Design an enzyme around this catalytic site. Structure first.
Site, PDB file in Angstrom:
ATOM      1  N   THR A  61      49.690  38.651  34.234  1.00 33.41           N
ATOM      2  CA  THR A  61      48.975  38.209  35.460  1.00 33.41           C
ATOM      3  C   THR A  61      48.559  39.387  36.331  1.00 33.41           C
ATOM      4  O   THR A  61      49.275  40.381  36.445  1.00 33.41           O
ATOM      5  CB  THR A  61      49.842  37.279  36.322  1.00 33.41           C
ATOM      6  OG1 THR A  61      49.814  35.978  35.768  1.00 33.41           O
ATOM      7  CG2 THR A  61      49.263  37.160  37.732  1.00 33.41           C
ATOM      8  N   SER A  62      47.412  39.267  36.965  1.00 38.34           N
ATOM      9  CA  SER A  62      47.012  40.277  37.922  1.00 38.34           C
ATOM     10  C   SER A  62      46.456  39.493  39.108  1.00 38.34           C
ATOM     11  O   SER A  62      45.467  38.761  38.982  1.00 38.34           O
ATOM     12  CB  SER A  62      45.966  41.267  37.335  1.00 38.34           C
ATOM     13  OG  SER A  62      46.484  41.948  36.206  1.00 38.34           O
TER      14      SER A  62
END
Lengths: 222, 196, 244, 250, 233, 198, 244, 204, 243
Positions: free
Chosen positions: B1-2
């Site tokens: 995830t970013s």
């Protein structure tokens, strides 16, 4: 196990294969994995089968009760919220992995639920040991605005992908079609591409073949 | 995830990639990691999907009840509710949450609530596994008081680097723009953002 | 047959809760206390009866702080008042714990309101024998409230309760009329001393001590504070001067 | 706080009466008339909607309720008591039965679960009896069609036909005279309509009368197809039109 | 009136009175008199102790609560044993947790709030004892009066018990004088024994009959009885 | 473990139970009687974990004696064994399970037959002509499968136990110090005072 | 508070009786008569339904005779709904006992348990007692055919023949007169119905007004059987014994 | 060590034409040690038969639980339970113990007294229904049973033929399992009569 | 004594006196309210009276914002009213959280009506002296009026009125509806539906109102809100022109 769910223009379809496994052994060659949460909200499950049966029925019952209380048709979001909160509470110990699909006064819906209680929304989904075969089909051929007919084909072919390629899956294809206008249609054994060939021999025994020690009549009446 | 949130001149923007994996498998390539807990208070989720959903649902319940009794809650209040859940249940959650909000008194605010449940107010915040790759980039390029379009660009560039290097990140870049104007949802597709 | 008044949560045939009405009687029998809202804060004042020289002056404080920004004063059964305030204190701590911000005065009013109402729902409790004037400053202004034994409360421009409540009300109405754009924290303080002094004609038999507190954005930085020394003395002079 | 009323509010007086149960039956006495008639191929339950304002929307207040796909209830007495009884009966049908055997309870068993809830309100600490009598009509595979009355005491009795509430002595007399063991559902519906007319003051029609039946399976009310062993509910509320259609034949 | 409204603490009378509370108040009035008073440096309790026979002991009226605080009672003795025991714990807690001597004023608030809980709920009864609390804390000397209505008052001096009004007038007259007895423990005690004498219509204060306690600036709460009060009669 | 053997003959049930009590490295006792009379025609022998053993037996004994007095009546062997089985089956899913194995030897006066019940600590009950817990079956079942007749007198039963015990004393590595032998018949419960020299 | 409304259901009168128990028995005396008679080869239970109407479904109806076990049955006089509460727990008890011992519960043990449940409502709890009297007909291999009775006090006693409900003194007298120890079951059927027929307050004794059961050794078997008579069977036996 | 393998044992059920059959061995073992040859694993409650394999204590307990509940059922319903309903009762009773499960493999067989339909079903240890029409296998030689039934089974066998099939399926599967055998019993079940036969088999 | 008149057990005429007495209490404020339904909105009008000059008129209100969609006006003493308000708010939030959609007006009413039924049945709880009128534009049923009372009764309404002078307004609306033959006010704009409400209130009661003598709540799709003094003034002005 292979389960898919596929959104089309006026509704949603789910499908599943029918092999039930215990380790390497096929326990049931045709069990129904498609489960009804209420008339128009249906459910396919992978994982521990006592759990998918149990969680599906508890929520189904609570849904029925909710519906009666509120005088409204059940919503897919309610099935989802109850399922997810229940699973979350039991921290993935209830081994339920579900695709849940339906139509209700607000439209047509497709979601997935994982044992630990997370949910996803999509236009196409798969779960089970066949997830990846199935997904190779939906990734290749899913498009915006399928007809009912194209959606059944797609769903159906995605299960076939898993039947032929996943050892965890086989036998037949069950479909259920939930269209905004209509009654949900459950189409048990929509495809049966695995009829066992005729045996080479008969194994019926000459009567009296089995050595008997003692016979007696059993008492069933009062 | 970013995931990331950035305050600018007219308020705050949240952005995120859309990939959720289980090991090498992309379980979902179009996830919505930008979650609404109030009209103009949103959060970005990272960590366990089950935990962050359970948390955001409880926070949205608490803030709907707050609203009924006391009118509109401050972003700081949202952060504080999130935090109470995260800190008090630290042993049993893996939730890394960024909270972003718009208020007329306070304008854009950003609070980061990392693993243990601590709270930190910041001009901007990055998080999720992709974040590690853009500490340098972000620290170099963030300036206070950017415009909508500058901020959108900074997020777009930032997340696309994060996506480029982090296998756990990918798919589309989503943004929610929060200002006095209202609430705007943006989406940017790989074919655009890989070209940067 | 009757007896509708022997038991706390019973409706009389005209729909009244006699026990609440009797709790009001204990209030009416109390010392007068008041509150005046000024245009950035609030002022609380109260009459303390000197039963005898033996009471240490300044020492038996009647006004109570809740959190850091709320003052409450009450007339009636004093211990009931404290119990109300203990609850208010729990109630504000909890709110602050969960929401970080200090409790808004309207929010806080309802917390006391619900709790006091609660004590009219059952026959296993008695209603509160107090009326409470209370308020302070929050994220959007000054707020002043009064809360009856039934749990009824509203926002007030000025408020009075106890033995001397008729003179106090009439004085308070005069202010509202003769200052239609507002009053200042400083003016409110003096004006409070005055009203308490006027109120003291119905208890003319005993000596009294005046107690004042305020919460004003400009004068106390939105924190509740007791009016001490020079300002208390000045206020006393004003009231003494204006009594004749 | 805390219910400190943990003694009985219904007790025995010197003559053997249970006052509160008697007083509850009195409340039922003044209730609007309701009736049940059992035929060879169904059961019909009926009552007057006695709307309390013409500004009310009377279809937002059912006195006839589904308890299971094959069981419905009607009452006479206090409506709010009935409503919560319905909630509890639907629930008990699931927790004491459907979640155990995977099917709906037979009529007599549900009735006996309702009856017990009522009995308990007659003896438990700190409550009053429910001020209602229910008529519960249903079908199940092994018992066929049945009709049960349940009173404030918690007693229940099976009936071929009966009436409760306001005009019930006359209505029961009317029913003793018209009932026989050969009636078909349309005949019963007809009798029910005639019996009801006697108790109803004002307008008599599909808007002021409420009527349901337990009859054949209505597959068109199931909501799905493809499981041949589910043919759908036997309970059906008649519509305003269906009722009027039958007052020409009156 | 009275009749129908004095049956429990949960009922107001129609004039807004609480009769069970007043009846408990009434048990104080029939207790043996006790006086408290203080200067800037010390606080003193004096109590008249009642026996039962000339064969019985005299019942104790002074209870020590901590090194710097203690009290006297008039009314139901077991009620005092309960409340002083609670006060003992409140003091103890403050030291254990905050390393801090409990202020005499907080002690009063704690007693007020404990009493109050027994005047608003069902099945309780009020306390039926009155209490005089002396202490020496960070703000000096203190005397408190507790009534089982929950009313706690801080004063220079007071008396409670039968015929307490004598002492209460005496002290009200002596005020300006006894407040000044600073650094003379014996004078202040003598001022207290004078106060208490204003309340004997009775008889004569003797050595198994008088009880005195003292607390102040360099003086832990301490109790004298017997030969130890001889020098004050 | 201890030696717990039962045999049901024509008219009686015989129980044989080893006498040793070892705590680790020492035999602390050579005369321990691993048995409780539950009722005048019902005997229970037991082996397993150290304190649980006697705590369980004594607890059972208390309950049956209670019933005997309440009802003024002696429960059947089969009734007693079911009670005991239920207790052990409870115990297996409790916080700390009784690790106890039992034989119940009873003479049923209403049926006029002896009955032998084997129940392990899981509550696994079976009725049997002969039985054992632990390792004792491994050395003695083959002798008992050979010589056992349902028509045996009490005296033949003893000689057959004698043999069983001798096969044990030859091949089993532990010295269990012999057995105490008890007979349950129509006349109640008696101890054979001599198996040392009988 | 709540004290005022408490009837005190579990206290003694000055004569040392339990009011609620006596009032409950009063209630029971107004109920359909129930009769049980014991013979060497069986037990009869006969009972009068109080009030009918031609619309009552006699086929689906049970107000008086309930099965506990395959070997135990009861007749009820009093509040039906109360009796169901007890009957259900008695059914649970019989099964518990079966599960624990693998033997059918002996009749007394079941009767004592139920009577103990009844006695409790008499001594603690503040609840009204159960308005029920039972006749228990049962069989076990210790005592053979047994008949017991228990009332709201939770006292129980055993009988060769007994009645509960209305008119028990008339019924008891008749029974005492014609009962003989060597009576055979078929006789007892006659006696039971003759007794009901003589004691009723109904104009006559028709089939639609009776419930009826026997516990026999089944004639042809070697073991015990409970026959709850269908309405027709009652009509038959009413003629066989000449009451048409 | 594995609670399902301490005691040994097998159950198989089969449907034919207007009949069902249910069989089991009679062994009860204590791991390697054969303990009893008389341990019947099949039970009935009215006309519904239940076979149970696995930990024997649980076998015994469950039978007693089902006796208890079916007794109470008949008392209230005034009719004997049917196979379909009973199957749901087994299922929800097992699932009630989801996290402290009984260690058993149950098998239900019977004929629906009203419809005349022959019914069989299986569960795993926490109650998942195996709903299939042809055969249900359970226990320690179930790998073998699956092998035997798949080859030997054909649909609509007459009772007397179904008997040979189920016996042969059981006997030969048992003989390839260490923990099964030591006797066998076979129930042939028709609407009107139920026959019980003990089989002669090898005793090692 | 007359114990059956102090707690909620039956009188020998089968009545619950405490419930009747609770209905009396609903009138102690001497405020009348009415609610009507538009084409796609719902309007509640309530009289606002502020006897005391020492009061802050902005805090005197019997109209509550229960949820984003649901509003409630109360006829009864303020403290009971606020007890009802806080509960309904709590119920509306929990429903949303448990089942994933906004609580419908009718279902909130059923729930609060059930809570009331309980006070009617358990001795230890008194009924509340309030009548609750709930309004929304429900997503399935459109504009909605559901009213609950101390008996636990509730039903839906085309329009409805409550308070001491309930009947005058009631008969006025009945007359309007006998004429118009439909079950709603036929106006596209909430503005006009507020205008109709006030007009018929004025005609029924025989009084004029300033902008401070009323209090107004409006439900529309996805919002319920109340009008400012100024919002109301604009509406009074409007009725005054043409009339």
């Amino acid at each position: 196990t292979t389960i898919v769910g596929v959104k089309f223009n006026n509704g949603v379809v789910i499908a599943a294969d029918t092999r039930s496994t215990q380790g390497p052994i096929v326990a049931d060659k045709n069990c129904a994995k498609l489960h009804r949460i209420s008339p128009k909200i249906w459910c396919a499950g992978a994982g521990t089968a006592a759990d998918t049966e149990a969680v599906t029925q508890l929520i189904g019952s609570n849904i029925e009760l909710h519906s009666l209380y509120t005088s409204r048709e059940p919503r897919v979001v309610s099935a989802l919220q109850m399922l997810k909160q229940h699973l979350f509470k039991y921290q993935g110990h209830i081994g339920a992995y579900l695709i849940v699909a339906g139509v209700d006064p607000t439209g047509s819906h497709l979601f997935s639920i994982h044992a630990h209680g997370s949910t996803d929304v999509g236009y196409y989904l798969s779960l089970g040991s066949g997830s990846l075969a199935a997904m190779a089909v939906l990734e290749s051929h899913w498009k915006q605005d399928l007809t009912k007919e194209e959606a059944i084909k797609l769903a159906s072919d995605a299960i076939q992908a898993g039947i032929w390629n996943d050892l965890g899956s086989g036998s037949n294809v069950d479909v259920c079609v939930m269209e905004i206008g209509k009654d949900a249609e459950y189409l048990r054994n929509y495809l049966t591409p695995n009829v066992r060939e005729e045996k080479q021999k008969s194994y019926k025994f000459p009567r009296g073949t089995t050595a008997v020690l003692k016979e007696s009549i059993v008492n069933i009446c009062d | 995830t970013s995931i990331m949130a950035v305050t600018f001149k007219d308020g705050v923007i949240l952005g995120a990639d859309s990939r959720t994996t289980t090991g090498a498998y992309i379980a979902n390539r179009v996830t919505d990691k930008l979650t609404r807990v109030h009209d103009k208070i949103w959060c970005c989720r990272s960590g366990s999907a089950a935990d962050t959903q359970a948390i955001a649902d409880i926070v949205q319940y608490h803030l709907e009840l707050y609203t009924s009794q006391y009118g509109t809650p401050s972003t700081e209040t949202a952060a504080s509710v999130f935090k109470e859940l995260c800190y008090e249940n630290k042993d049993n959650l893996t939730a890394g949450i960024i909270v972003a909000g718009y208020d007329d008194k306070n304008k854009g605010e950003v609070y980061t609530i990392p693993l243990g449940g601590s709270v930190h107010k910041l001009p901007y915040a990055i998080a999720g596994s992709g974040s590690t790759f853009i500490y340098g980039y972000c620290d170099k390029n963030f300036r206070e008081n950017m415009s909508k379009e500058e901020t959108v660009d900074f997020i777009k560039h930032s997340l696309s680097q994060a996506i480029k290097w982090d296998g756990s990140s990918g798919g589309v870049i989503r943004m929610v723009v929060l200002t006095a104007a209202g609430v705007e949802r943006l989406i940017f597709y790989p074919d655009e953002y890989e070209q940067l | 047959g009757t007896g509708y008044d022997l038991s706390n949560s019973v409706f009389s045939p005209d729909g009244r809760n006699f026990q609440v009405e009797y709790a009001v009687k204990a209030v009416e029998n109390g010392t007068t206390s008041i509150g005046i809202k000024c245009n950035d804060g609030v002022v609380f004042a109260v009459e303390k009866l000197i039963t005898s020289k033996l009471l240490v002056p300044q020492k038996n404080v009647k006004i109570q702080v809740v959190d850091r920004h709320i003052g409450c004063v009450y007339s009636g059964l004093i211990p009931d008042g404290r119990h109300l305030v203990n609850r208010g204190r729990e109630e504000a701590a909890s709110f602050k714990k969960l929401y970080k911000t200090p409790i808004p005065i309207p929010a806080f009013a309802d917390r006391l309101g619900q709790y006091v109402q609660a004590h009219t729902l059952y026959n296993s409790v008695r209603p509160f024998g107090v009326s409470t004037i209370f308020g302070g400053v929050d994220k959007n202004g000054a707020h002043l409230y009064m809360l009856e034994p039934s749990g009824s409360y509203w926002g007030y421009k000025g408020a009075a309760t106890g033995k001397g409540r008729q003179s106090a009300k009439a004085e308070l109405e005069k202010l509202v009329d003769h200052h239609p754009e507002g009053l200042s924290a400083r003016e409110a303080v003096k004006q409070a001393a005055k009203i308490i002094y006027l109120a003291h004609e119905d208890n003319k038999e005993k000596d009294f001590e005046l107690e004042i507190s305020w919460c004003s954005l400009s004068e106390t930085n939105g924190l509740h504070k007791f009016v001490k020394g020079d300002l208390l003395q000045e206020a006393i002079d004003f009231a003494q001067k204006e009594i004749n | 706080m805390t219910d400190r009323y943990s003694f009985s509010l219904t007790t025995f007086s010197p003559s053997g009466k249970l006052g509160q149960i008697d007083y509850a039956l009195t409340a039922v006495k003044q209730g609007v008339t309701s009736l049940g008639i059992k035929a060879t191929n169904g059961v019909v339950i009926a009552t007057e909607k006695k709307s309390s304002s013409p500004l009310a929307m009377s279809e937002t207040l059912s006195k006839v309720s589904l308890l299971t796909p094959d069981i419905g209830a009607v009452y006479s007495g206090m409506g709010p008591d009935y409503r919560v009884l319905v909630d509890k009966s639907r629930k008990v049908a699931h927790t004491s039965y459907k979640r155990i055997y995977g099917e709906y309870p037979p009529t007599k068993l549900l009735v006996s679960e309702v009856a017990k809830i009522m009995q308990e309100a007659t003896q438990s600490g700190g409550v009053r009896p429910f001020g209602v009598s229910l008529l519960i009509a249903g079908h199940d595979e092994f018992n066929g069609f049945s009709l049960y009355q349940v009173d404030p005491s918690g007693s229940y009795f099976p009936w071929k036909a009966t009436a409760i509430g306001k005009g019930s002595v006359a209505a029961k007399t009317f029913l003793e005279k018209r009932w026989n063991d050969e009636l078909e559902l349309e005949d019963a519906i007809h009798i029910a309509l005639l019996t009801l007319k006697e108790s109803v003051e004002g307008e008599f029609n599909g808007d002021t009368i409420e009527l349901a039946i337990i009859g054949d399976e209505n597959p068109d009310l199931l909501g799905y197809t493809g499981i041949p062993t589910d043919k759908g509910p036997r309970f059906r509320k008649l519509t305003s039109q269906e009722i009027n259609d039958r007052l020409e034949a009156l | 009136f009275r009749n129908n409204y004095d049956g429990d603490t949960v009922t107001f009378s129609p004039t807004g009175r609480l009769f069970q509370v007043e009846y408990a108040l009434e048990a104080i009035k029939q207790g043996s008199v006790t006086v408290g008073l203080r200067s800037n440096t010390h606080a003193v309790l004096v109590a008249l102790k009642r026996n039962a026979d000339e064969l019985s002991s005299y019942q104790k009226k002074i209870i020590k609560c901590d090194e710097h605080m203690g009290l006297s009672l008039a009314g139901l003795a077991p009620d005092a044993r309960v409340l002083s025991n609670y006060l003992r714990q409140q003091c103890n807690y403050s030291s254990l947790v905050f390393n801090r001597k409990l202020a005499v004023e907080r002690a009063g608030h704690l007693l007020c709030d404990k009493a109050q809980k027994n005047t608003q709920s069902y099945g309780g009864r009020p306390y039926g004892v009155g209490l005089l609390i002396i202490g020496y804390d960070k703000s000096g000397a203190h005397l408190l009066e507790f009534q089982p209505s929950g009313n706690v008052t801080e004063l220079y001096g007071t008396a409670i018990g039968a015929r307490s009004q004598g002492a209460k007038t005496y002290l009200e007259r002596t005020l300006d004088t006894f407040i000044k007895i600073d650094g003379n423990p014996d004078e202040l005690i003598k001022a207290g024994v004078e106060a208490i004498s204003q309340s004997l219509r009775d008889e004569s204060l003797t050595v198994d009959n008088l009880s005195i306690a003292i607390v102040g600036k360099d003086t832990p709460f301490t109790i004298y009885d017997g030969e130890a009060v001889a020098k004050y009669i | 473990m201890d030696i717990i053997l039962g045999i049901r003959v024509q008219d009686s049930v015989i129980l044989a139970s080893s006498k040793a009590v070892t705590r680790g490295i020492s035999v602390l006792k050579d005369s321990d009687d691993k048995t409780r009379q539950l009722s005048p025609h019902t005997l229970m022998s037991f082996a397993g974990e150290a304190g649980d053993t006697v705590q369980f037996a004594e607890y059972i004994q208390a309950n049956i004696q209670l019933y005997s007095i309440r009802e003024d009546y002696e429960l059947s062997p089969q009734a007693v064994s079911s009670f005991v089985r239920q207790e052990l089956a409870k115990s297996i899913r409790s916080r700390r399970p009784y690790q106890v194995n039992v034989l119940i030897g009873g003479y049923d006066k209403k049926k006029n037959k002896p009955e032998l019940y084997q129940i392990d600590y899981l509550g696994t009950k079976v009725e049997l002509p002969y039985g054992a817990h632990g390792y004792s079956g491994f050395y003695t079942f083959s002798l008992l499968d050979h010589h056992y007749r349902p028509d045996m007198t009490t005296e033949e039963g003893l000689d057959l136990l004698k043999l069983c015990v001798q096969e044990l004393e030859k091949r089993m590595p532990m010295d269990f110090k012999g057995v105490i032998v008890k007979i349950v018949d129509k006349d109640g419960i008696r101890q054979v005072d001599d198996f040392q020299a009988q | 508070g709540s004290r005022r409304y408490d009837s005190r259901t579990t206290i003694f009168s000055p004569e040392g009786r339990l009011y609620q128990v006596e009032y409950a028995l009063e209630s029971i005396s107004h109920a359909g008569t129930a009769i049980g008679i014991m013979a060497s080869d069986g037990i009869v239970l006969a009972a009068e339904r109080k009030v009918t109407s031609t619309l009552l479904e006699q086929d689906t109806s049970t107000e008086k005779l309930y099965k506990l076990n395959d070997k135990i049955a009861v007749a009820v006089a009093g509040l039906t709904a109360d009796a169901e509460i007890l009957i259900n727990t008695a059914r649970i008890h019989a099964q518990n006992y079966l599960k624990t011992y693998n033997e059918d519960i002996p009749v007394e043990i079941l009767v004592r348990r139920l009577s103990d449940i009844k006695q409790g409502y008499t001594q603690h709890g503040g609840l009204r007692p159960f308005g029920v009297s039972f006749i228990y007909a049962g069989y076990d291999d210790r005592y053979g055919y047994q008949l017991y009775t228990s009332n709201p006090s939770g006292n129980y006693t055993g009988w060769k023949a007994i009645s509960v409900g209305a008119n028990t003194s008339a019924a008891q007298t008749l029974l005492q007169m014609d009962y003989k120890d060597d009576m055979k079951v078929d006789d007892a059927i006659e006696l039971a119905l003759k007794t009901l027929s003589k004691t009723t307050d109904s104009s006559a004794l028709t089939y639609d007004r009776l419930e009826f059961a026997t516990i026999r050794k089944g004639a042809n078997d070697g073991e015990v059987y409970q026959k709850i008579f269908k309405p027709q069977e009652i009509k038959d036996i009413l003629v066989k014994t000449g009451i048409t | 060590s594995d609670p399902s393998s301490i005691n040994g044992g097998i159950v198989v059920a089969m449907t034919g034409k207007d009949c069902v059959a249910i069989a089991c061995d009679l062994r009860l073992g204590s791991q390697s040690l054969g303990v009893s040859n008389k341990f019947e694993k099949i039970f009935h409650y009215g006309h519904v038969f239940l076979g149970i394999t696995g930990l024997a204590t649980d076998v015994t307990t469950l039978n007693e639980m089902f006796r208890y509940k079916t007794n109470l059922y008949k008392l209230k319903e005034e009719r004997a339970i049917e196979p379909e309903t009973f199957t749901q009762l087994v299922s929800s009773s097992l699932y009630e113990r989801r996290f402290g499960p009984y260690f058993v493999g149950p098998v239900v067989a019977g004929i629906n007294s009203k419809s005349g339909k022959p019914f069989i079903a299986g569960f795993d240890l926490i109650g998942c229904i195996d709903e299939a029409k042809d055969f249900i296998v359970s226990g320690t030689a179930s790998d073998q049973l699956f092998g035997m039934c798949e080859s030997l089974y054909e649909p609509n066998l007459e009772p007397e033929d179904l008997f040979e099939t189920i016996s042969q399926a059981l006997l030969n599967a048992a003989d390839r399992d260490a923990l099964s055998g030591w006797g066998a019993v076979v129930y042939i079940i028709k609407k009107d009569e139920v026959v019980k036969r003990y089989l002669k088999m090898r005793q090692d | 004594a007359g114990y059956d008149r102090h707690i909620t057990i039956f009188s020998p005429e089968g009545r619950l006196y405490q419930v009747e007495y609770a209905f009396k209490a609903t009138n102690q404020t001497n405020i009348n309210s009415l609610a009507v339904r538009g084409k796609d909105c719902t309007v509640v009008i309530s009289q606002k009276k502020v006897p005391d000059k020492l009061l802050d008129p902005t805090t005197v209100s019997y109209i509550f914002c229960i949820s984003r969609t649901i509003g409630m006006v109360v006829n009864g003493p303020i403290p009971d009213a606020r007890n009802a308000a806080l509960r309904a708010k709590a119920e509306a939030a929990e429903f949303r959280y448990k089942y994933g959609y906004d609580m419908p007006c009718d279902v909130l009413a059923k729930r609060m009506a059930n809570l009331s039924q309980i006070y009617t049945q358990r001795a230890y709880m008194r009924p509340l002296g309030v009548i609750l009128t709930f309004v929304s534009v429900d997503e399935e049923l459109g504009p909605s009026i559901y009213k609950t009372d101390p008996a636990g009764y509730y039903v839906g309404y085309k329009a409805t009125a409550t308070g001491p002078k309930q009947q005058e307004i009631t008969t006025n609306l009945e007359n309007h509806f006998k004429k118009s033959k439909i079950d709603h006010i036929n106006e596209e704009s909430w503005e006009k539906v507020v205008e109709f409400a006030i007009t018929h209130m004025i005609d029924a009661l025989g009084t004029e109102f300033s902008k401070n003598d009323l209090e107004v709540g409006v439900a529309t799709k996805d919002k319920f809100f109340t009008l400012s003094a100024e919002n109301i003034e604009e509406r009074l002005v409007a009725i005054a022109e043409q009339d």
